[PDB]
């Protein structure tokens, strides 16, 4: 039943992981982070980039 992302909903569809090991969210739904295809290289979520 765990929830993730900035939307705090259960996992579904394609999800991307934040590369900051101290990220409190860790996983996000592609659409919630405006992703259609997985990006190339490391990826950091909005929260960690603007921390």
């Amino acid at each position: 039943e765990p929830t993730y992302c900035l939307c705090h909903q259960v996992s579904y569809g394609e999800m991307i992981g934040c590369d900051n090991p101290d990220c409190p969210i860790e996983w996000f739904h592609f659409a919630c982070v405006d992703l259609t295809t997985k990006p190339k290289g490391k990826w950091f979520c909005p929260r960690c980039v603007q921390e």
């Binding site: 569809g13 999800m15 996983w27 592609f30 190339k40 990826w43």
Partner: peptide, 7 residues
């Protein structure tokens, strides 16, 4: 980037 498909 690391991604996964919800099972």
């Amino acid at each position: 980037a690391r991604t996964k498909q919800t099972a």
